[PDB]
Amino acid sequence: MIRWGLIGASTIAREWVIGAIRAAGGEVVSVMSSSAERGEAYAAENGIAKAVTSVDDLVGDPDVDAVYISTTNELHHGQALAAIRAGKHVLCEKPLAMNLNDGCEMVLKACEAGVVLGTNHHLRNAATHRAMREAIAAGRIGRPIAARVFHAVYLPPHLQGWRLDKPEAGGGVILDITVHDADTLRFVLNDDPIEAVAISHSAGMGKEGLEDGVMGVLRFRSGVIAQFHDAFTTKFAETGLEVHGTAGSLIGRNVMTQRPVGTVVLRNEEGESELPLDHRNLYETAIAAFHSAIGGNGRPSASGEDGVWSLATGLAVVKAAATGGAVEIETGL
Amino acid sequence: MIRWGLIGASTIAREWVIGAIRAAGGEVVSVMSSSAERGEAYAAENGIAKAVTSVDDLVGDPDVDAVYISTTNELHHGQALAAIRAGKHVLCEKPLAMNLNDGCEMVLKACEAGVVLGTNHHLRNAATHRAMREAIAAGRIGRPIAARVFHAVYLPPHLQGWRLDKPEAGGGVILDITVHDADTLRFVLNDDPIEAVAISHSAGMGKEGLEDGVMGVLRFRSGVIAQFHDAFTTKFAETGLEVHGTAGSLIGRNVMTQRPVGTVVLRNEEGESELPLDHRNLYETAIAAFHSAIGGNGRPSASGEDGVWSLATGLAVVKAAATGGAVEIETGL
Numbered sequence: 001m002i003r004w005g006l007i008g009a010s011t012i013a014r015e016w017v018i019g020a021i022r023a024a025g026g027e028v029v030s031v032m033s034s035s036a037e038r039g040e041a042y043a044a045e046n047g048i049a050k051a052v053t054s055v056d057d058l059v060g061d062p063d064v065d066a067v068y069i070s071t072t073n074e075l076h077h078g079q080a081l082a083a084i085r086a087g088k089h090v091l092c093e094k095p096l097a098m099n100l101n102d103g104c105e106m107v108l109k110a111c112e113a114g115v116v117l118g119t120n121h122h123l124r125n126a127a128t129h130r131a132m133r134e135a136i137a138a139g140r141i142g143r144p145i146a147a148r149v150f151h152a153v154y155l156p157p158h159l160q161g162w163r164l165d166k167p168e169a170g171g172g173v174i175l176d177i178t179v180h181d182a183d184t185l186r187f188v189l190n191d192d193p194i195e196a197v198a199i200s201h202s203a204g205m206g207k208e209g210l211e212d213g214v215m216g217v218l219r220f221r222s223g224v225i226a227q228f229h230d231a232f233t234t235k236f237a238e239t240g241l242e243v244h245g246t247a248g249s250l251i252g253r254n255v256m257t258q259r260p261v262g263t264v265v266l267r268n269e270e271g272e273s274e275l276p277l278d279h280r281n282l283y284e285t286a287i288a289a290f291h292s293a294i295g296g297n298g299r300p301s302a303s304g305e306d307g308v309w310s311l312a313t314g315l316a317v318v319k320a321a322a323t324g325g326a327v328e329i330e331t332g333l
Numbered sequence: 334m335i336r337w338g339l340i341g342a343s344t345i346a347r348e349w350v351i352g353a354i355r356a357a358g359g360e361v362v363s364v365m366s367s368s369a370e371r372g373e374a375y376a377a378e379n380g381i382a383k384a385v386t387s388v389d390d391l392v393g394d395p396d397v398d399a400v401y402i403s404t405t406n407e408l409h410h411g412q413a414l415a416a417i418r419a420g421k422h423v424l425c426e427k428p429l430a431m432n433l434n435d436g437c438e439m440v441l442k443a444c445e446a447g448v449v450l451g452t453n454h455h456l457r458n459a460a461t462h463r464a465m466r467e468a469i470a471a472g473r474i475g476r477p478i479a480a481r482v483f484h485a486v487y488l489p490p491h492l493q494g495w496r497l498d499k500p501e502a503g504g505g506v507i508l509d510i511t512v513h514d515a516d517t518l519r520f521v522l523n524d525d526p527i528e529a530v531a532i533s534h535s536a537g538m539g540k541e542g543l544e545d546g547v548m549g550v551l552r553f554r555s556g557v558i559a560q561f562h563d564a565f566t567t568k569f570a571e572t573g574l575e576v577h578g579t580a581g582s583l584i585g586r587n588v589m590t591q592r593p594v595g596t597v598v599l600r601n602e603e604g605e606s607e608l609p610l611d612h613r614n615l616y617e618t619a620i621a622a623f624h625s626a627i628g629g630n631g632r633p634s635a636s637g638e639d640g641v642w643s644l645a646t647g648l649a650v651v652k653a654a655a656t657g658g659a660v661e662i663e664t665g666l
């Protein structure tokens with residue numbers, strides 16, 4: 001079996017990724033946590049044989065083949081570099097890095113190391129998004145003209161779960177949600193964004209206010225214009241992703257969550273019908289693709305390059321919102 | 334009865350406004366058309382006693398009390414000024430004018446003339462939009478956070494209806510659709526937009542291409558961020574208007590057309606339910622309000638000032654799309 005080591009004893013690894021690794025035929029052999037106590041307790045609760053408290057004891061363990069990183073965002077880049085230096089494959093939760101030169105550097109070093117580097121954008125693995133991508137390529141909507149993304153949800157400010165715990169350094173809806181919208185759009189449209197405009201909302205007067213909502217528009221290389229709406233403050237808005245074309249529209253409802261749910265309708269001259277979907281665990285699909293890539297068959301679902309694309313788009317959106325100006329998206333890949 | 338004269342022997346006056354005037358207790362006594370033949374034929378077909386071919390014979394007719402203007406956009410400002418000089422009330426199809434100083438001048442001259450000046454933004458008359466406005470003011474969604482407008486429809490390029498007829502000087506989705514979205518948002522939110530960002534699409538390479546789609550964002554004075562999507566090129570997208578708040582969301586579907594149709598759902602902690610609506614002809618409602626205003630009771634549905642607001646927002650959106658920069662919306666009222 002491919003044996004994984006975890007960097008970050010996280011909620012997402014517990015809820016989704018550990019089970020996904022095992023479902024896809026791998027095994028999770030070790031977990032690294034900055035805290036000895038947290039790592040041991042987490043190892044016992046999730047059936048993992050070993051807990052460590054150094055990154056090097058994780059990535060350097062001869063019996064770890066691959067590393068999954070789900071620590072706080074600012075730790076990703078350096079922990080991925082350590083794994084790559086140890087010659088281990090890396091699946092990294094977004095973001096890869098906090099800036100583009102660091103993200104580009106990762107992709108190059110992984111390539112130079114001969115290891116698989118993946119960004120865990122989960123949504124592009126859903127059968128909903130895959131159906132839309134495939135229907136578009138099959139001409140079922142003629143030429144795509146416009147896209148819409150709805151990702152305005154409710155995330156209580158500060159959690160965790162014991163109360164309103166650790167400092168938790170932000171840092172906003174754009175870098176936490178919009179980047180997933182960007183990657184999913186790139187997947188569905190099979191095309192790249194070239195510029196962004198945006199307006200964002202921060203709580204309380206311009207400050208250390210959490211950026212808690214954003215709306216904007218991406219211009220894609222094809223000419224498609226794609227709007228997005230991401231927030232932490234709206235309880236009663238369902239998520240969605242739509243693509244409107246010259247001969248049809250695809251309407252995805254409830255398709256931007258972590259769970260394998262949601263519908264896609266195709267509307268065209270015949271009327272409306274639901275596309276048939278075989279829903280499957282997004283994370284199971286991501287791990288399977290990663291395992292095939294390690295095997296020298298195929299690529300991760302989202303590559304290091306996709307992660308650089310999502311980071312560049314996010315950074316563009318932050319700048320367009322802050323400056324009021326349209327910003328060109330350039331990856332430096 | 335209040336007796337109306339028509340300036341423009343138009344599709345909209347035939348389909349909607351003539352019948353609305355009569356339903357609301359007025360009468361249409363004359364029609365002005367630049368063509369004698371068209372005006373006579375139109376008068377006979379629509380049961381109007383008189384056709385003329387000069388604006389002054391229309392506005393100066395002692396038996397016309399009020400004037401409805403639905404000519405080509407560039408004629409509005411000057412024809413409204415003639416009516417106002419003749420001391421007649423004016424209901425003007427959007428736009429009032431092509432620039433802000435001309436729109437502001439109209440409002441002032443109408444006020445100085447002692448006549449009612451209305452802009453015929455039809456949508457704010459619908460029971461759907463009215464229900465949303467009222468539910469918001471009643472606290473049914475807590476504090477509004479975000480709005481979304483969907484107005485991407487199919488309008489064949491060039492019509493008319495005999496084939497692909499007269500030159501028809503454009504001039505785009507922003508000034509033809511976005512301005513109605515703006516006015517409706519102002520009505521529903523009871524608040525003003527203060528800045529815009531946008532990206533627009535023109536057919537064929539940057540040129541004399543028709544601007545045939547736009548997406549953008551308005552920042553409102555309250556802090557609400559409101560996105561819109563308007564187009565001429567999408568056949569299979571339903572229209573809609575939504576408002577998402579801290580304690581609920583209002584979802585309007587099929588509510589941006591001329592017809593008295595559409596639904597509004599309120600989603601909140603109880604679930605989702607349809608708001609009960611008494612649908613009524615939008616134009617009948619607009620005329621009734623105008624007739625009351627002439628009577629010295631109440632105001633037109635949308636005033637001259639609302640028309641200046643819609644024009645300023647439209648002009649901001651054109652500039653933000655052209656320049657890539659956020660533009661502040663200032664009415665000069």
Ligand SMILES: NC(=O)C1=CN([C@@H]2O[C@H](COP(=O)(O)OP(=O)(O)OC[C@H]3O[C@@H](n4cnc5c(N)ncnc54)[C@H](OP(=O)(O)O)[C@@H]3O)[C@@H](O)[C@H]2O)C=CC1
Pocket residue numbers: 007008009010011012013032033034035038039069070071072073093094095159160166176
């Ligand atoms: N709500 C969210 O957190 C969201 C997260 N993401 C993405 O998912 C990834 C992980 O997120 P998620 O699984 O939700 O995060 P968790 O809060 O479950 O874990 C993240 C990190 O916080 C630390 N931590 C966990 N529990 C405690 C505790 N009781 N006291 C102190 N520190 C603790 C852990 O440190 P250690 O590993 O050292 O034990 C862990 O690496 C991130 O990389 C992020 O990009 C995306 C959107 C929302």
Ligand SMILES: NC(=O)C1=CN([C@@H]2O[C@H](COP(=O)(O)OP(=O)(O)OC[C@H]3O[C@@H](n4cnc5c(N)ncnc54)[C@H](OP(=O)(O)O)[C@@H]3O)[C@@H](O)[C@H]2O)C=CC1
Pocket residue numbers: 340341342343344345346365366367368371372402403404405406426427428492493499509
């Ligand atoms: N599709 C549209 O036209 C849209 C219109 N609007 C708004 O509605 C208003 C009127 O629109 P609508 O009723 O659709 O326009 P119509 O095309 O029906 O009429 C507009 C003008 O075009 C002229 N016209 C009409 N028929 C002919 C013909 N056979 N040959 C030459 N000229 C002709 C008329 O001139 P005359 O009056 O001199 O007879 C008339 O004033 C406008 O002010 C605009 O702002 C808004 C969105 C879309």
